[PDB]
Amino acid sequence: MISLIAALAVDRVIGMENAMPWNLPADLAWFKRNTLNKPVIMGRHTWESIGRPLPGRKNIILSSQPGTDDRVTWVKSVDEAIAACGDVPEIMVIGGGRVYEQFLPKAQKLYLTHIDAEVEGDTHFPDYEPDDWESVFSEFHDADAQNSHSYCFEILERR
Numbered sequence: 248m249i250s251l252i253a254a255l256a257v258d259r260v261i262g263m264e265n266a267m268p269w270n271l272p273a274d275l276a277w278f279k280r281n282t283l284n285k286p287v288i289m290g291r292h293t294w295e296s297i298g299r300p301l302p303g304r305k306n307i308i309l310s311s312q313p314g315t316d317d318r319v320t321w322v323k324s325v326d327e328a329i330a331a332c333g334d335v336p337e338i339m340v341i342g343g344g345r346v347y348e349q350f351l352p353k354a355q356k357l358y359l360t361h362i363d364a365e366v367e368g369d370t371h372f373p374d375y376e377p378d379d380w381e382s383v384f385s386e387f388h389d390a391d392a393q394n395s396h397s398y399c400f401e402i403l404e405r406r
């Protein structure tokens with residue numbers, strides 16, 4: 248099964264100038280917890296924004312160019328990415344925008360964080376048909392001393 252995980256600000260913004268302007272440690276804890284010990288698939292731009300391999304996870308990067316780092320696995324197509332994961336229960340697709348768009352039709356599950364933030368961005372989460380998805384978990388949090396915005400963890404499963 249293929250899953251997508253993402254953090255969306257208002258108007259499905261997910262990034263700006265190859266970075267994420269907000270800082271939500273609670274959300275990054277949620278990301279870690281839901282990805283650890285699973286393969287993660289990402290695009291090249293997202294690899295360059297993270298800046299390092301994510302520990303405890305098989306890092307798989309999509310790029311039409313040859314790899315420039317043997318600490319991670321490089322692939323050249325969507326099908327090859329999926330094959331490189333092997334026989335695992337859950338593949339996590341961690342973006343960015345162009346990668347998300349390609350894996351959304353294959354995905355059975357979405358892990359979305361909705362952040363109450365107004366941010367100008369250049370990258371959006373793909374527009375998905377709400378009828379196709381059933382919310383099976385929701386958890387709202389108010390802002391606190393560590394998290395400057397209110398946010399909502401949501402898990403959706405394809406109907």
Ligand SMILES: NC(=O)C1=CN([C@@H]2O[C@H](COP(=O)(O)OP(=O)(O)OC[C@H]3O[C@@H](n4cnc5c(N)ncnc54)[C@H](OP(=O)(O)O)[C@@H]3O)[C@@H](O)[C@H]2O)C=CC1
Binds near residue numbers: 252266296345
């Ligand atoms: N808020 C969130 O949840 C997340 C936000 N982001 C943000 O998204 C932005 C980056 O997203 P985006 O600009 O769309 O870039 P992507 O991360 O989606 O990566 C795009 C690159 O990945 C390669 N690629 C994608 N698909 C293929 C394919 N089928 N075959 C071969 N190569 C492929 C290409 O590399 P190449 O050009 O070398 O061929 C392409 O240029 C950043 O700002 C990041 O911070 C990222 C993840 C999560």
Ligand SMILES: Nc1nc(=O)c2c([nH]1)NCC(CNc1ccc(C(=O)N[C@@H](CCC(=O)O)C(=O)O)cc1)=N2
Binds near residue numbers: 277278293342359
């Ligand atoms: N919900 C969600 N939030 C995000 O911030 C996110 C996402 N999903 N999907 C992809 C993505 C891409 N960018 C990044 C950037 C940094 C880390 C990172 O440093 N993660 C550490 C966090 C450790 C912690 O704070 O607990 C990790 O080990 O996963 C991960 C993904 N970011």
Ligand SMILES: [Mn+2]
Binds near residue numbers: 333334
């Ligand atoms: Mn197999």
Ligand SMILES: [Mn+2]
Binds near residue numbers: 363364365395396397
């Ligand atoms: Mn806010």
